[PDB]
Design an enzyme around this catalytic site. Structure first.
Site, PDB file in Angstrom:
ATOM      1  N   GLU A   1      68.685  27.482  -9.150  1.00  0.00           N
ATOM      2  CA  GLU A   1      68.092  26.515 -10.067  1.00  0.00           C
ATOM      3  C   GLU A   1      67.240  25.520  -9.252  1.00  0.00           C
ATOM      4  O   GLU A   1      66.030  25.725  -9.105  1.00  0.00           O
ATOM      5  CB  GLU A   1      69.183  25.809 -10.889  1.00  0.00           C
ATOM      6  CG  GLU A   1      68.681  24.990 -12.082  1.00  0.00           C
ATOM      7  CD  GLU A   1      68.275  25.873 -13.299  1.00  0.00           C
ATOM      8  OE1 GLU A   1      68.803  26.998 -13.443  1.00  0.00           O
ATOM      9  OE2 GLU A   1      67.431  25.411 -14.109  1.00  0.00           O
TER      10      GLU A   1
ATOM     11  N   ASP B   1      72.411  16.029  -5.477  1.00  0.00           N
ATOM     12  CA  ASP B   1      72.982  15.184  -6.540  1.00  0.00           C
ATOM     13  C   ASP B   1      74.031  15.884  -7.407  1.00  0.00           C
ATOM     14  O   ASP B   1      74.664  15.238  -8.242  1.00  0.00           O
ATOM     15  CB  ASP B   1      71.909  14.444  -7.378  1.00  0.00           C
ATOM     16  CG  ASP B   1      71.147  15.361  -8.342  1.00  0.00           C
ATOM     17  OD1 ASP B   1      71.286  16.614  -8.243  1.00  0.00           O
ATOM     18  OD2 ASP B   1      70.395  14.830  -9.219  1.00  0.00           O
TER      19      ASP B   1
ATOM     20  N   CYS C   1      70.212  14.263 -13.387  1.00  0.00           N
ATOM     21  CA  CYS C   1      68.844  14.839 -13.206  1.00  0.00           C
ATOM     22  C   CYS C   1      67.858  14.428 -14.305  1.00  0.00           C
ATOM     23  O   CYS C   1      66.658  14.711 -14.255  1.00  0.00           O
ATOM     24  CB  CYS C   1      68.931  16.307 -13.363  1.00  0.00           C
ATOM     25  SG  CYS C   1      67.417  16.909 -12.502  1.00  0.00           S
TER      26      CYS C   1
END
Lengths: 367, 368, 364, 366
Positions: free
Chosen positions: B214, B220, B357
């Protein structure tokens, strides 16, 4: 931000201040549509850039622009001018922008009129105008300002002028026309202006000078320079397309009183000696439903279509012999302001001028 | 306003990226819709982003930017205290295509506008094109009247690094050293960019992330700074977890790491969902060649680490997993004086990420 | 229509015919983008209209156009020219169009190459090109034609020329460049051309004349006039930006034989005497990532960029002293065709000419 | 192609043929707008795909689609269905499509009516409709067909039905409503229909069944099955939303003769027993100016909204107890055709059905 529902500006203590009252910032839309603007808008983009630059010396300036033109727009304009993406159908933010109102206590709200491209499907200038009609709300959102939406009532900011002291000046030719609010009586229209601008007296001029374009917006004919003081176009050239309308407006204004009972002090403003016209050689697309721009069309070149902005006044220059005279006359109207002429003939080919491509945002006062 | 700042760097100009736990003026989000990522034309995920936006607004002024077509719906769905702007975009991941804000000690703020390429461009990116995404950072800076540095020919996403505001950055080799990012640059050149643009002196390299396909392993989803000298790290002892090896290694590395001020990192464990979150099958998602497919049984990257710190609140993913409450408990202990808010965000995770995100903080000016 | 998968034109018995073979239709995209075309495309739209009109005298003509320009485009073009809505990023259908192939047994298919705006993110001319890359399929759908998509292989129709008899002519400068297929060897690229055009011999010229624009497309340098016969640009002016490339192409062609073993007959075609340049006064937007159009830029004005279409040949006219000579020379190459010059300097400012803005569709 | 100016279909010898006359191909627009269609159009896209698939067994099929949906659309539809990019505002090609007319000599032209989204700014279903209004011309261009544009005259194909033999059947509720042609008298409107369809007799039904949606389009109420023969909805359930209008249409048809003097043979068609309704849980955007889709809204589920197409008839199926009965009844109307039911409840949520999402193109004859 929020919509204000169930109340009017008047009821809530908000008023539209005069354009000569202090301004926080000014707004403009970037022009481009090729069925109005020649050469895919390249010449008019230069003129709008020059107007934006002129205003920015007096007042923070803002330009909103389509997805496609965003990068070019940001490159063309100096960095002190803020650029936002905003969809639009054409570039006349005086008319599809919000009309800001303020109270005594440091708050500001917007009036979001219904916009219909100056007459909708009766005699409007293009179709559709759905993105134009959202500009007012989007600018209010940017500013975190709550707004009144005038459901089923069509109006443009260029169709009226306020003194900020209880008076509005407008034209019958525009507001009473079939393509605007044909179901409403003159009295019903007066009530909407009173309620939304916070005024108590509506001064009706008759004809404007652009029956086919905006249906005679007052901002090409007359405006308030200060409370109790108006400027009015004037010419003695009986061949002028503006002659009858200028003469009648002038005579009406002389005997008008404002909401405070002051007899209006009327200051004459010249008109261009020569007609500004569309040339057949202009490279403008024809689209059924969009106002044609045909060889010999007389453009509405009025010096009255100026913007008052803080310590400055931004005045049309058309390349006419009267360009200098216009600047002199406006200077005497605003003796303590700096008068800046900008070459805007490229704007006038598209149906208006400096006043019709700008919308001021007044400073909040009080609190 | 926005000018571009040219011929200098944030570090040279005395600007630094503050930690995400430092005070914030505003938070930003993009409204989701693309039907080749989001099932049902985005309707379920729009509800999730709305809930996230609402949760943030309790702590910090909130802002959502949205396409021409979705503007009216978006404005209707969101409460009026959340400001809505029109802004073109290709997908809704503003942590990654947004600006990274930097501040100085004189009350000024600037933006870092990195080159965005949809997490790997034409090598291994997630869709094509990303031209509108790549303009978001400048447009948000314009709205804020903030001048910006553009990193010409240097690709980076905000989600790929974390800072302590005190000279340290934490990142992953899996992401920054991948072919689809900056393959012409050495690891040292990449470190230099981080130092110059974030104003840091020490780059802490984790190895693998947990989402190689991805984002190529964004930090994060793995670890973050809770305060200067203190990190949180995902942890599991389930050897069947697709996150196991990467979680264990990140944890071991961090226990051996010191920050730029020489402090031994204090590592706080964060649990992982017990059960995998997977794409069904029956989800109504368009297939388009060049857009990352969403196929039955695909394991979604459901990490509790993908939370947002925002002023007096922390907004934490909830996946419908047995460990949802444990995650909230653990985050509360990391931030004992903050209010911890869980939001059901499984609908966001189907699209490749989560709360951290889909947001981008804008720090308060200080000095200022 | 269907994608044909697991086979190639050569395997299936289809070939790309010569441009001088009979044509059913010709295609064109309507130009507009203001960061290439001055004055929001108004001058160039007039030139494209004139090119479309000239072609329509010989062959049914078709123009495809954006949502915004559809109404204007339909008004500007005479009704015998068919107009379709079709999204696009710029107006170069020679390069993003399908290359049609026929089996000479009544069938026709399209080859849908990967398009990347002449070099993608390495040295391409704008970003993005996602809508351009859909043009080939959309035109195939209109024509009810099945197509071969060349996955992970980038090519433009303007980068090669075929004789329809087993030979292709191309340039090393274009096909071997970093922004095209850098993972492939020259031999692998040869094989793709053989498979998809149905050829057996690849004739490699070296340099083209526009390294910065298309990376040296062959269609500005040389083309087939008939099987065994080519035209090549030529100039003796050592100050020409075209000089070395024209000279080398000519010399190479004189030593080449085609797939049938025929020594190529090589005709010289003049070049404009004076450089065509971008003027500072031109009103063209600058956008980072879009090829700049700056004052003094030399525009690639080649007379070779003509379209052969049934009984006509449509030839660039640049306002140069050699405009008439070019028409004379082309007439001698095609003695039985009608040669029509069109004023196309407005097209050349945007990086190419008549051949680049058209795509033929052969008769079945 | 060319606009034909200064003449009408009738003057030029062109007529709109019955829908039961041979067809060359059928058209459809791909649906997507999220302020009509729930879930960003995913459920309705499956339904339109099924309708297109069914039609394709009888008659070549074509779908036109937005820039954004083109690739998804082409993937979903089988390759025999041709796909074109075409901007649009919603997906109702019966109504914004061209109405094709033919002469006796192998030619075909299109009538391009003014479209205004079923009532424009008076009571139309969304704003704007500028791209919808270009669909007729773009389809005509694809087909290389010249067209008549009806300046200042608003009409939708779903608002009338023809027998191809001088008769048109329509509703007062629709054609005489304020949002259509309020400057025109009934007689002026009749003249436009006669001139553009090439008809001599206008048969006026009164109410349709969907006053809020299309203002009562005839194609939900009655149609021609053959010259001299009509189908008409029918119900004896007094609670039916369709009762009053079904009853009145039936009584009027029983008293009507066509342009050739034939007493109409009237064939009953059932109506769904249960109302199809919008559920509040449907994920549909609200936009001021777009017809709201609110919990409990009664959807216009009529079996009459079927497409006759060469050897097939494509009939709505709503998941109602009367679904089978509807197929039986249509079969008896067209004893030599193949009747195909398609599950189209997802279409009906958006205001119409199979007939409103299709536009036939007749075969050239002679």
């Amino acid at each position: 931000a929020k919509r204000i529902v169930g109340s009017t500006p008047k009821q809530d203590g908000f008023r539209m201040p005069g354009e000569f009252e202090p301004q926080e910032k000014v707004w403009m839309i970037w022009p481009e549509r090729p069925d109005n603007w020649r050469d895919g808008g390249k010449p008019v983009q230069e003129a709008f850039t020059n107007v934006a630059k002129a205003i920015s010396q007096f007042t923070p300036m803002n330009v909103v622009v389509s997805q496609q033109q965003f990068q070019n727009c940001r490159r063309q304009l100096p960095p002190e001018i803020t650029v936002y993406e905003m969809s639009n159908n054409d570039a006349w933010v005086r008319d599809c922008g919000p009309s800001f109102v303020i109270n005594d206590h440091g708050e500001i709200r917007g009036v979001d009129w219904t916009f219909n491209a100056w007459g909708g499907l009766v005699d409007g200038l293009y179709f559709p105008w759905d993105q134009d009609d959202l500009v007012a709300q989007k600018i209010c959102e940017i500013e975190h300002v709550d707004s009144y939406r005038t459901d089923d009532f069509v109006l443009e900011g260029g169709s009226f002028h306020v003194d900020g002291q209880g008076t509005v000046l407008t034209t019958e030719m525009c507001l009473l026309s079939e393509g605007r609010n044909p179901q409403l009586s003159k009295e019903a229209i007066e009530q909407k202006l009173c309620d939304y601008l916070n005024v108590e007296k509506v001064l009706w001029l008759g004809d404007g000078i652009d029956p086919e374009e905006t249906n005679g917006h007052v901002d090409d004919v007359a405006c308030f320079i200060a409370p109790g003081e108006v400027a009015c176009i004037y010419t003695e050239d009986q061949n002028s397309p503006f002659y009858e309308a200028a003469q009648d407006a002038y005579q009406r204004l002389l005997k008008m009183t404002d909401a405070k009972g002051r007899q209006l002090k009327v200051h004459k403003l010249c008109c261009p000696v020569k007609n500004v016209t569309i040339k057949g050689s202009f490279k403008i697309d024809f689209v059924e439903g969009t106002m044609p721009r045909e060889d010999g069309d007389i453009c509405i070149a009025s010096y009255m279509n100026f913007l008052i902005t803080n310590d400055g006044v931004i005045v049309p220059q058309y390349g006419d012999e009267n360009d200098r005279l216009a600047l002199e006359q406006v200077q005497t109207m605003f003796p303590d302001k700096k008068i800046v002429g900008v070459n805007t003939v490229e704007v006038v080919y598209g149906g208006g001028n400096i006043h019709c491509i700008t919308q001021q945002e007044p400073k909040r006062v009080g609190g």
